[PDB]
């Protein structure tokens, strides 16, 4: 039978202003039968009309897949407005209803330091700034960094560990020209998740 | 039935005293009386030494072939193809592996003390940077006072812009313990390391 996959928005999406975040209702394994698929989005057990929904496409396994998308408010989102997806086909006993939200458990503030590159690795031609982003949640966070007041590109950050305490924690790191390192550069790491203050803080990093 | 393929333990492949296994799993079978046949090979000539796991299935039914593989063999790259005969199916299905094709690289392993507004705080980090190695296939450990240490976290392996892979391991530990000058040590393994092995070590300045 037909089965419904209810996934949540991109961490991005939810936290930058200029972002749209959507939560997607996937129906697959729809058969040639019993193609019509239906859609009933709720916010908070409140149905909404607004939602978008894409036209069937086959698959090249011989089934349909139908896909509807709803955008979510930002403060919504974050305030743990639950969204349902309903999904009737006549290939079901009964239609299937799916919720997704923001994750449950108690919110916690990232806290997030700076490390310098090993004394080791001074002796190479490029050199590693460390960011440490540790026991936040939830795990929707964004990770960026700067330098003289401007955007670096060229950074790389690991996915979200679940940690023992619950938490999470990640790493972003830089890499730059030994040079650029020693001419006293300052370097900035920033961070944006909900429980921060204003969902951002930054924290930056120079030769000593 | 879906045929799924997968790879041994990276400490597996590393240590001549291990056994490295190559497992093939069929999902999704009929309990119409289907009954499945299998035909491994490498690189072309089949294989008779694969042992099928017994059976147990689960509510809503998997059958699965362990090949344990030649150590050299797998370093070298060589597919192990795992082909599942089955009525349910039009024609076999075949699915293959092997190591990450590439010339290998090895990692540099660097080790970094805790940051000065931990210092602040009951409990501080201890990181190992593990960077610019290719295949991502790698193992990392934590040891103190030639005993290991089991209270570290280690993210994925990152692909950078090289091609290769990075990664941070962390190192929990009480800041009291820290301060009594103990060492700790990142150990990691990895194929083109020399001995597959290095290890870094950390402690107060
Ligand atoms: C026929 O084809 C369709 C389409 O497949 C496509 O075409 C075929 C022909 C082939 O070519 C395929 O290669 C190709 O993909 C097949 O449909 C697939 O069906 C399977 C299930 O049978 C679905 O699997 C689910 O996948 C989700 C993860 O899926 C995301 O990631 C996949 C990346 O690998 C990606 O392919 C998916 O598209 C999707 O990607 C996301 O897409 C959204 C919206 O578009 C986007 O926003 C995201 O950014 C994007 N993400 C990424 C990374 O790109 C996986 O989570 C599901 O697993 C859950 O459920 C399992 C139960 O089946 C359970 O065991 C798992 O643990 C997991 O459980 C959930 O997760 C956690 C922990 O369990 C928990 O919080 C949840 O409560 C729990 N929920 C549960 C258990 O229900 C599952 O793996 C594929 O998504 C789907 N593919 C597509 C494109 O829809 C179809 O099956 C084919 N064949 C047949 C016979 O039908
Ligand atoms: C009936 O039930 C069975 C039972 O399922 C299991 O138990 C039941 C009770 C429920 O709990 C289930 O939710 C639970 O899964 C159902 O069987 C499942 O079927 C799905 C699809 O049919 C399979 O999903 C795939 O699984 C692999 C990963 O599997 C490993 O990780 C699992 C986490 O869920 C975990 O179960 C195990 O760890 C598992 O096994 C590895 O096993 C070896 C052997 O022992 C072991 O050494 C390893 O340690 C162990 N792994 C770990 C971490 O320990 C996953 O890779 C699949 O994703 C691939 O396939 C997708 C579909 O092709 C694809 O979209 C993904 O991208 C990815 O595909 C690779 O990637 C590309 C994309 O880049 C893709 O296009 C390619 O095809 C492919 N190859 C390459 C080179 O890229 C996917 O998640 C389940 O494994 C299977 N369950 C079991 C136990 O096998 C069955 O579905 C039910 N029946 C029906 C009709 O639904």
Redesign the interface.
């Known amino acids: 039978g037909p089965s419904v996959f209810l996934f949540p928005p991109k961490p991005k999406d939810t936290l930058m202003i200029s972002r749209t975040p959507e939560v997607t209702c996937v129906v697959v394994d729809v058969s040639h039968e019993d193609p019509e698929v239906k859609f009933n989005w709720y916010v908070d057990g409140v149905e909404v009309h607004n939602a978008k929904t894409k036209p069937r496409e086959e698959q090249y396994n011989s089934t349909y897949r139908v896909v509807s998308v709803l955008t979510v408010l930002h403060q919504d989102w974050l305030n743990g407005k639950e969204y349902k997806c309903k999904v009737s086909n006549k290939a079901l006993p009964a239609p299937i209803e799916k919720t997704i939200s923001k994750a449950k458990g108690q919110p916690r503030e990232p806290?997030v330091?700076?490390?310098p590159?090993?004394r080791?690795?001074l002796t190479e031609n490029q050199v590693?700034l460390?960011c440490?982003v540790?026991g936040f949640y939830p795990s929707d966070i964004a990770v960026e960094w700067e330098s003289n007041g401007q955007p670096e590109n060229?950074y790389?950050?690991?996915?979200p560990?679940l940690?023992?305490d619950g938490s999470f924690?990640?790493?972003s790191?830089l890499?730059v020209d030994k040079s650029r390192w020693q001419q006293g550069n300052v370097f900035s790491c920033s961070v944006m998740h909900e429980a921060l203050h204003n969902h951002y803080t930054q924290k930056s990093l120079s030769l000593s």
């Open positions: 806290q330091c700076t490390l590159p090993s080791d690795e590693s460390t440490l540790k060229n790389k950050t690991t996915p560990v940690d023992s924690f990640l790493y790191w890499t």
